[PDB]
């Protein structure tokens, strides 16, 4: 959010964020959908790979362009700069490519269902299948996958380069001025370390943090309209909505509570840290003396060091114990909410695999957010370090 | 169950003219396949898949039709078309077919030959009398048969069978039989046997006295 | 290919019968074996299936605890068994075969049946007679001769002429039933000149009983 | 292999090779079964968790218990120590529970099947299966998941006691002459951190490179007893052992062509860490003196860091493209070779899921070995540390 890179940590970010909020609320909400009415938008997609030239997702890459080019030009324009290319379009080219990469997750999940449909017909009657249709569906999905592949390398080589750009922005801001900041302790540290630090860290975590939340808005309308199936779960009875609420409660509470039951290990981490760093000074100072390193202090020191780690090696145990419990159940716990349903003869194998898809998917995806805290500390600790070191 | 109509439930036709039955389901299937039963014999498929003509059979036939709605058409029939075809579906795990058509073939009309004949010497050992009179090749299939005793109509104690339409030039064929004990049998003297058809408004009349031979 | 199935069965109300389909010519293990059932009213009904090379077997829902299907994959054949038949289980049963795998030629081959009659009355032999011409008619260019087989039971009988020498303008029509007894008749004809020139025979054959009669027809 | 702990770096070890390899070809090929004969050891294996009583374990447990006390008590009076208890113990009780666990996950891999039949039982035919024996079986795998959690935890809490026990031995062992190791520099650091990180890496690798060569044999003949039942490949044509080949060569292939086509990434790294370093001292040198840092230096130095940067960043794509392809073709890979088999009529819905769930399993078993190698060499570099700096 420096001064160099990125024009302002003011008025820029914030014109980003109402500009986005405009165009959002213009889009779903209020409808531009409408301009699919002026073209001849069909409103269907298909299942395959030929779904990325349909005209529902090229009308959105235009808008897409459209607003990104207004909001750049006005910023060119007005503030000029000297990385204004890096800092606005690598930023909004990133964000697209996150967002695409959600999509073919989302179309190959949608394509386990006639699969498992054609494996069911063809072990139960064996004359109404031929092998030729197990080869085309094979087709299909490496149609998908091969996009995934190409995109995917392509978004690693041009995120490396961005970050490598925001190092040798503010490197060459520092160094402007070094003679002025000679005499600050500990700035060759600063200079060759932090810079790197700080950028890939703070991408890293913006990176996690838009990914899980996209998941999230991408995958509950399916499990909405996929509940309509499974009316009755095998305690709770009847209940409007009842995948979804169990599923959120599931995921919710294992990835919150190992979380929580967990909280305490860090300060014994670094209790451990402080206690060795005690030593070694100890025997430094006794290493060139006669009288500094003596039977007596050395032992009381190990002494301290061995109490102190038992500590650690005895908390460890509840954590361990929750998060194997937690990772043995969940093998069959997406299964059982469906043992009703399957009895009743209601779902056909194809949207128990959808549903069980679903599960891990939406499980995944509030596991980013609690590593994004965890980033965040991280970064604050070095932005607190070079926001002291700047006069 | 998908219930499977056929229509019509008789045919006719003529040695030349083209054929067509209909057999609608009550769901779609798309999985349809025709057979053919002879007289006395088992069935045969013709087309299978509703298109796809099988191992070598006459090209005169052809089926179609798609959804709920299929038709089996025959182009020029012949002497030799003369069965009863069904229709079966195979889209579940019951597996229904269907009423069955049977197919006649028309032609020029003709006369039966009549022929009467009296128990053996071996039926007046055994204590019972049987006399039995044939008709062959007549055409139509409606004929009536009469029985006469000294000019008294005799209604009870017979006995007819016929044959199914023949395979070579669609004829058929009467037995009629009349069962009687040796004192009813030696009390009368003279039998005969009357067919009435449509050819002909004369009854033709055989007949025979026990005096002579 | 060819299916061979079991011979002609009379049955007393109560007992359970087996039926057998044995296939020689392919090999069952790429087919389906169904069994169709059809009654005296010509319209035909199907029972169950199975699949040979695992052992899956399917029936329709009415005939569910009545009868059962099963395959014999070492030595092709198939078994059907019917328990606690009433007088409603006369037909005639057929098994066919079904290509699944291995698709090519005629995909669907059907046996040949086996009458089952369930009965209570007691088995007979038939009474055969030979018919003659009446006195002084034989004027004619043509004369018939008719070979007459009655009072026996169960079906059926093997009528033939002359031991299947003569098989041109013969007529046999189909046995019917009198108080638990069957009847049927046979007419043949030739021309004036070959008889009595030449020797004319009925044979008869009633495997169910163990008999065989053979009748020369004479002038009277 | 110190001299402190584990009684003596030489016939020990070699002791204890021998007579173990006497065991084992006492028991496996030379018929130690007929002990069986004595006791009533029926032969049959059952499937819930009461498998881990019958005597055709119980009569294992005897002998392994034999062996080692006899074993261990010839040692103890030979040759007396102080820490022969966890020295000789510590270690047979962590070989054993290794082998514990690879059997526990060999009994959950045979559960797979008869559920995932009966679920297809209750797909095909609405009528005849209820909800009380789906029920029957999530008791019976929780029943299973119970022992696992517990022995996992346990096993945990031992490995990091008896890691301490070594380091304490020998840190002690060093502290006993101190006063003579005092002149060699880099005593302190030496002392501090080397032990605790040589303890660690090599019990790390002896426990994985164990696991390894125990799940092969373990899992190799259920792939061999399996694959009667798929006779015919999709593109070959017939082989006798074509599942067991498949499997090999595509879980080899996969491993170990990634790991020999991102074979020349760390020297890439040596040489970015290099240039790093020369900037940062020749930034120290400069902080304070006037007349050290030059725009000329400083350039120069900045440019051979982002040069050698950017050949690392180019290089990286062979390896995630590989890596990418690899993994998304494995998703269907595994289902690919089943088409004709599941068509002709041989394999039931349980038999897809062994036979998916072995293939993961072998394939996994070929990662610990590279990773026994990468810990091996690291270790190496410890162990010429710590032996150098012994007079």
Redesign the interface.
Known sequence: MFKSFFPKPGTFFLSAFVWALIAVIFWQAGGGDWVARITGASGQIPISAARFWSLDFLIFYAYYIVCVGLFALFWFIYSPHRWQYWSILGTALIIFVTWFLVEVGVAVNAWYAPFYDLIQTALS?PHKVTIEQFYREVGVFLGIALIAVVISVLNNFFVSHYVFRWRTAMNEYYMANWQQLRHIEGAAQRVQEDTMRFASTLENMGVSFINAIMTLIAFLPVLVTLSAHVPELPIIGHIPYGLVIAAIVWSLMGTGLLAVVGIKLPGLEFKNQRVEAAYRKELVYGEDDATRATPPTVRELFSAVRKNYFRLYFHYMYFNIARILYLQVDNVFGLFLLFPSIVAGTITLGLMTQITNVFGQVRGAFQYLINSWTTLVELMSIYKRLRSFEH | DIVMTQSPAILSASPGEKVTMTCRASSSVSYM?WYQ?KPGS????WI?ATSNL??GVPARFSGSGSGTSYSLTISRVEAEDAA?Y?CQQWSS?????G??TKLEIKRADAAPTV??????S??LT?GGA?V?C?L?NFYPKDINVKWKIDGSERQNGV?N???DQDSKDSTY?M?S?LTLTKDEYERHNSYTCEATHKTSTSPIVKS?NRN?? | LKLLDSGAELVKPGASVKLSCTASGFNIKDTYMYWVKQRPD?????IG?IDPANGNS?Y??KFQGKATITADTSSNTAYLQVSSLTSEDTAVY?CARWLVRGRR????Y????TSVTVSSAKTTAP?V???????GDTTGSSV?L?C?V?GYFPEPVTLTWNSGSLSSGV??????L?SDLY???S?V?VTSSTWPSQSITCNVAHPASSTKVDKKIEP?
């Open positions: 009657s | 396949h039963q088992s069935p045969k498929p299978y099988a191992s009863t069904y795990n019951p597996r229904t077919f009423g069955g022929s009467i004949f009296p128990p053996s071996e039926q055994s049987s039995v044939f062959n006995l069978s016929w044959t064929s037995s039989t025979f002579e031979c | 010509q319209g035909l009904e199907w299936r399917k329709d829902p057929y030629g005629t995909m669907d059907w046996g040949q049946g009474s007679y030979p018919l003659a011409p009446v006195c018939t008719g007459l009655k007529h046999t029509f189909p046995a019917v009198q009847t049927l008749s007419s004809t009277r």
